[PDB]
Design a protein around this ligand. Structure first.
Ligand SMILES: *[C@@H]1O[C@H](CO)[C@@H](O[C@@H]2O[C@H](CO)[C@@H](O)[C@H](O)[C@H]2NC(C)=O)[C@H](O)[C@H]1NC(C)=O
Ligand SMILES: *[C@@H]1O[C@H](CO)[C@@H](O[C@@H]2O[C@H](CO)[C@@H](O)[C@H](O)[C@H]2NC(C)=O)[C@H](O)[C@H]1NC(C)=O
Ligand SMILES: *[C@@H]1O[C@H](CO)[C@@H](O[C@@H]2O[C@H](CO)[C@@H](O)[C@H](O)[C@H]2NC(C)=O)[C@H](O)[C@H]1NC(C)=O
Ligand SMILES: *[C@@H]1O[C@H](CO)[C@@H](O[C@@H]2O[C@H](CO)[C@@H](O)[C@H](O)[C@H]2NC(C)=O)[C@H](O)[C@H]1NC(C)=O
Ligand SMILES: *[C@@H]1O[C@H](CO)[C@@H](O)[C@H](O)[C@H]1NC(C)=O
Ligand SMILES: *[C@@H]1O[C@H](CO)[C@@H](O)[C@H](O)[C@H]1NC(C)=O
Ligand SMILES: *[C@@H]1O[C@H](CO)[C@@H](O)[C@H](O)[C@H]1NC(C)=O
Ligand SMILES: *[C@@H]1O[C@H](CO)[C@@H](O)[C@H](O)[C@H]1NC(C)=O
Lengths: 753, 752
């Protein structure tokens, strides 16, 4: 265990012992450097300023340590690093990491006079002009990295490293690879040349490497190859060539890499063509990644014989008009990508040979219509993508041979799919439509966003039993009914941004006992007129029903009503229903009925007439409904509405009325609310008022703007007012015709005696 | 997610890994890379001139909570989002801006569009901040400014008023102006380390009320004010390290009742501590005073604080101690006094402390421990006494601590011996004074680098729970099997000792399957006959209980070549000089070997006609018996059996030539005789019978034989040849005195 050195005046370095790693700051006044030391795992030495004074240090005692990470600290000129770091006697060090920024250091064997048994090594930002003799003294060195330094390597610097395993030459900006730079690397298994400026790779560039398994040229400036560039790498298995600017690959580049397993060739822009049988006869090959290139057409024999492929990516090219038999020899192919390829159409027999194929991509192409035989023998297909195409429709037998299709994506298309699109030849054998989704019982997720869908097919809730999502946004849905909601699984049936004018529901919900059945209904020109009441009563009332509509953004589309109103702040009383089917309603009157309250409105208040308009009987059933509400406020010349007898009116409003000389014939059977404003109250008689009875329903009368004579012949009116005080809206406002003042003060004067 | 479609009229490309999608602009060379998560992060770093991202194609990436910029230059006045508009990210909840390129004078215009930002961080780029620069955020929880020289106005932070974590690290602040923290009501950390604050005024923390965990880890603080911390009623932690001040004001922490953790270390100039500095701190839990320069302490330093569970006082310059320094701390758990200059411990130091689990006293200069030092420690678990000057241990040192588990006594002047504790009072002739019998559960004990004489039997008798032990660099005289009586998986260590010899019983065994490890490396272990049992134990065996590590073992003054290895050990090399002066001649002693089981003189010497007669050195206690003859390649006067040859179990001669041999001269009591370079081939009466097949290794050899021809000896030669199978006669036999009389010669041939 390493503990802090005993405090003394000989040394000014302050050791702060932490539970994990003992810390240091040797110049106590100004800690220009700190030495974070673990027990025996690592040593972290970093300098912050120009002065070094390594000789004026307490001579720490660490002993054996695995990793020695020195950062941004100077080295003595042409002296061993362990000699320049004598103030800590690190020994038996395996890994050495040297970050250095201020000054580049020319390297020779004299800098490594203490690291004969070094396993790992790393250099960064500070190494320039490595000498050929630098690595001679090393024994059993397995890794080497030259990280972020501008460098130029003469051929032969690595000849002394026989046992080297991983070599990293990233970011060095090498201009070119001399033939024979890797002479001594006989046991090399991996190599990296990413982020360099290698102009070209000659035939003899990779001489001396035979057991190499991985290669890496991720970012270079390679303008051309040679036909025998990779011929010397018989053991190659992984190859990464990205972001290179070359125009084409030479014929037969991989003629000898029979052990190839993965080939990542992506973003190699300006790669317009691929040579004939580039990847032929590679049994071990399993993953091919040719995305983001600029290829315009693939040769037919590109993959002839490579039966071991399981993943083939070809996205983001300019690849159109695929050859028919390109994928004939790949029976293990699992994932195929063809997106962003500008494909106008694919050959009918393109995918017949692949009996097994899990996931297929065809998105972002320019497909117009899929062939019926495209998916005949894909018995293992699971995920299908067809988004962002120019599809008009789909053949009726398109999914006959893919019964295991879990998820499908058809968004951003021009699919029509009318209700009668797949109507049978008048057979009528099956109630469900003949849409191709009928055989897809395994379907789970379906997307149809941004389409021209104009219905919800019956097979989407009858045959598909495990459906759990059905996106139908931005397509021309005409309406919604309760039948189409008869799903048998938790489904988030999205229906936003459709032309859903109206929706119909029944008061009883047959939903199975489960969590919920969401229906997103945000932006629709919903008609808040008749036939929508039960939906409104459902949404506004709080209940534990399965249906959970999301109508927070939903508004109405009725100019007569409050347009742009929300249901959460909508008066359900104001729902109205026009009587368009009937023609016996009085002319020049707003004819409608409200189903919630069970009322029918005549609304002849707009016009003024000489007689009471004929009020049609509620011949329309309206669920066996027998009450009428009439507004006749403007008409004040009828002189009698005596047709009210043998009628079922329940509301009456006469803001302006003729002289109130009415007979008991006018007295109605079922009138709840009555208004007699702006009339001659003097003409009315007690016998008519006596026959008024609240037994049928509650009675409320209006005495506003009414003039009634007060005298002995007009007696008992005050008693009737007192009895009907609740009926009278303002009994005090009722006044004698000549006096114009309330008769309450003169109630004692009412009695003649 | 999906990279931009078709990459048309764009010089920047997408990688689209399954975890995150990278970007570069490699049209000529990729200067900058942008990699994004689904919604978590966006990292943006550029490595060249800013003109390379003047008009990049817009990425239109979804808004992500965390944004990062590295070494990217931006314009003088336009906001950050406007400069990086091509990213098209708006919902930012974390911003980090590393900028090594060029300092920029921040104005309030830079952060428009981030009115919901948190975890704002400005590293290495800020040079100066104008007032109300942070105004407008309206909700900020964490801020950090680091690695950049600064000089701030008092009213810079007034606008925030919701900040909880503030960090001004390595900013090179010359000093703290009063009221510079005025507007930070809800602050809860400062992290003012690595600055250059010269001193703290009384009003240096005016605007802070909900503060906790004030940090001053590295500063050039020269002095403190009396009421520096008075303005902070709530203050949980306080870290004040690596400062050049010489003393603290009296009553510095008077008003901070909530003080829970005071870390005050590495103040090399802090010569003394004020009295009752820690007074009346009930909530205090851990206090750290290590690595200071304090030389003396006041009596009332910790008065009125019973909540202390940890107290570190190590690496200081303490020379004396107060008596009641820990009177008011009955809840203490650990006490560190290591690396100080303490020469003694007060007798009444720890009567009132009972929850102490571990007590550290290493690297001090203690002369001895008082008997009642540990009298009241009912929960002591670990004890350290390393690098001290302890002479001996009192007999009742561990009387009051039965819970003790580990003990460390390295690098001490300990001189424990067999009679260092034995007293005639109540003597039981065993377990002298019981120095360690009171510790039942003593697991680990280190006595490395001491002057202990002998192993106390108490370690191997009643310390059943012992798991390890180390007696290296100690003056142990020897080892015996009786010392190995442990009842657990003990790993005893005796490396580099003065053990002359080990006496191990041949029938040593242990019933349990638990293993015992013993190391004798660098021990003299002189190799004599008694070491034969140790040699056998070291020899490879199928299974054993005492696994010996003897790779670096050496033999003291060896009879054989010096620095002999155990790989070259042999049974014959086990022979040792006998201690019986009368029994063996003074010229050379009897071998009396045990493994070899042979007795022979080491040197031939002058020689005698008759070998001396001595009793068997083994005396029936060993298989050892005389089997060899010292005389070799010498003209012996005679070889008589009565000259102890009969007493010798066997006879072995080397290049000894006898002209005449007789049956009387041949030893009958000896099982067999072996001779070489004999001058006579005649067969004696004893030679007429073949020596015993078993228990008689010595025999006759055809080689190095001289034939003698005589008619009477022909029958004896015939009898010898009948038993002989190597050859009819000697290979180098050329004798024919007018006839054939050799053993190969037939009966018909005669000597004449
Ligand atoms: C030299 O570096 C390599 C890679 O950095 C180290 O490899 C380790 O390998 C083991 C094998 O499973 C992994 O678990 C570790 O995570 C790897 N380490 C690292 C840092 O990636 C190797 O250990 C290093 N050699 C020494 C002596 O430290
Ligand atoms: C819905 O899909 C239509 C497809 O027409 C999108 O409208 C654009 O149509 C033109 C046709 O010439 C395409 O070139 C464009 O790419 C389409 N726009 C986009 C953004 O892809 C329309 O934008 C889509 N609506 C969405 C996705 O909300
Ligand atoms: C801003 O930083 C804070 C502090 O790191 C984050 O909050 C969490 O803080 C705790 C502190 O104990 C950490 O252990 C967590 O890891 C932090 N959360 C995360 C997600 O890292 C906070 O999340 C940060 N803000 C954002 C938007 O990431
Ligand atoms: C064993 O302990 C002794 C002392 O207990 C060590 O000797 C001391 O070494 C230091 C090293 O600077 C000197 O300052 C002291 O004066 C020495 N004291 C004595 C009494 O010699 C010794 O180094 C330790 N190790 C060994 C292997 O003996
Ligand atoms: C390589 O390893 C082998 C065996 O591990 C060893 O014999 C040889 O000396 C090593 N060479 C170098 C240069 O380390
Ligand atoms: C819907 O999800 C809930 C969640 O617990 C589950 O209990 C219920 O069974 C699901 N619906 C069906 C039809 O399984
Ligand atoms: C219908 O009723 C409303 C209610 O206020 C009234 O304003 C309107 O004039 C009526 N219309 C007709 C034609 O009577
Ligand atoms: C702190 O946050 C609250 C919560 O939104 C806000 O109202 C207040 O204005 C913020 N304080 C400042 C100074 O912006």
């Amino acid at each position: 265990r390493f503990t802090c050195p005993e405090e003394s005046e000989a040394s000014n370095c302050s050791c702060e012992e932490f539970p994990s790693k003992t810390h240091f700051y040797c110049p106590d006044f100004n800690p220009t450097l700190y030495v974070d030391v673990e027990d025996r795992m690592r040593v972290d030495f970093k300098c912050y300023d120009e002065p070094h004074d390594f000789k004026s240090l307490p001579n720490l005692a660490i002993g054996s340590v695995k990793l020695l990470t020195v950062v941004d600290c100077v080295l003595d000129d042409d002296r061993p690093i362990l000699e320049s770091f004598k103030f800590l006697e690190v020994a038996d060090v395996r890994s050495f990491v040297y970050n250095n920024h201020e000054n580049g250091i020319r390297y020779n064997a004299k800098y490594f006079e203490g690291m004969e048994q070094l396993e790992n090594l790393t250099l960064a930002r500070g190494v320039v002009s490595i000498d050929r003799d630098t690595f001679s003294g090393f024994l059993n060195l397995k890794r080497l990295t030259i990280e972020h330094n501008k460098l130029n390597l003469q051929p032969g610097t690595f000849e002394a490293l026989s046992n080297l395993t991983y070599l990293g030459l990233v970011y060095n900006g090498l201009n070119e690879i001399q033939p024979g730079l890797f002479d001594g690397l006989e046991s090399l298994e991996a190599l990296s040349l990413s982020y360099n400026d290698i102009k070209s790779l000659s035939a003899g560039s990779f001489n001396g490497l035979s057991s190499l398994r991985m290669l890496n040229l991720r970012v270079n400036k390679i303008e051309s190859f040679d036909a025998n560039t990779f011929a010397s790498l018989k053991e190659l298995s992984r190859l990464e060539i990205t972001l290179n600017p070359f125009v084409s690959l030479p014929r037969g580049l991989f003629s000898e890499n029979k052990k190839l397993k993965t080939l990542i060739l992506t973003n190699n822009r300006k790669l317009v063509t691929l040579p004939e049988e580039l990847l032929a006869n590679l049994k071990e090959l399993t993953v091919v990644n040719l995305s983001h290139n600029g290829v315009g057409n693939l040769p037919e024999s590109l993959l002839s014989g490579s039966s071991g492929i399981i993943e083939l990516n070809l996205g983001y090219n300019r690849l159109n008009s695929l050859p028919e038999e390109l994928l004939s020899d790949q029976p293990q192919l699992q994932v195929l990508n063809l997106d962003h390829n500008q494909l106008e159409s694919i050959p009918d027999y393109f995918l017949e040979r692949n009996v097994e194929l899990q996931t297929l991509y065809l998105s972002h192409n320019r497909l117009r219509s899929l062939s019926e035989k495209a998916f005949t023998k894909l018995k293992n297909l699971k995920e299908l993508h067809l988004e962002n195409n120019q599809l008009q429709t789909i053949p009726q037998f398109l999914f006959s041979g893919t019964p295991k299709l879990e998820e499908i994506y058809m968004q951003n298309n021009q699919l029509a799919l009318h209700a009668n699109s797949f109507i049978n030849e008048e057979l009528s054998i099956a109630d469900n439509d003949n849409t191709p989704f009928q055989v897809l019982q395994k379907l789970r997720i379906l997307h149809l966003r941004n389409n021209s869908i104009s219905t919800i097919f019956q097979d989407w809730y009858i045959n598909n039993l495990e459906m759990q999502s059905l996106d139908l946004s931005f397509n021309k849905l005409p309406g919604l009914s309760y039948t189409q909601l008869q799903f048998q699984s938790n489904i988030t049936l999205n229906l936003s941004n459709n032309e859903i004018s109206q929706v119909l529901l029944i008061d009883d919900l047959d939903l199975q006992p489960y969590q919920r059945i969401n229906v997103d209904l945000n932006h629709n020109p919903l008609n808040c007129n008749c036939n929508a009441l039960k939906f409104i009563q459902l949404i506004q009332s709080k209940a534990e029903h399965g249906l959970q509509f999301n109508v927070d953004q939903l508004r109405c589309s009725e100019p007569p009503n409050l347009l742009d109103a929300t249901m959460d702040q909508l008066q359900t009383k104001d729902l109205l229903c026009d009587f368009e089917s009937a023609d016996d309603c009085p002319k020049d009157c707003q004819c409608a009925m409200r189903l919630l309250d069970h009322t029918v409105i005549v609304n002849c208040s707009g016009r003024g007439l000489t007689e009471f308009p004929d009020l049609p009987i509620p011949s329309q059933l309206h669920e066996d409904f027998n009450a009428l509400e009439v507004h006749v406020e403007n008409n004040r010349l009828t002189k009698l509405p005596n047709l009210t007898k043998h009628n079922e009116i329940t509301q009456l409003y006469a803001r302006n009325n003729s002289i109130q000389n009415l007979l008991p014939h006018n007295i109605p059977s079922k009138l709840r609310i009555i208004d007699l404003s702006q009339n001659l109250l003097k003409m009315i008689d007690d016998s008519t008022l006596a026959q008024i009875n609240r037994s049928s329903h509650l009675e409320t009368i209006r005495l506003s703007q009414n003039q009634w004579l007060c005298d002995c012949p007009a007696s008992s009116f005050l008693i009737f007012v007192q009895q009907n005080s609740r009926l009278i809206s303002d009994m005090s406002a009722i006044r004698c015709h000549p006096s114009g003042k309330s008769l309450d003060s003169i109630t004692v004067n009412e009695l003649c005696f």
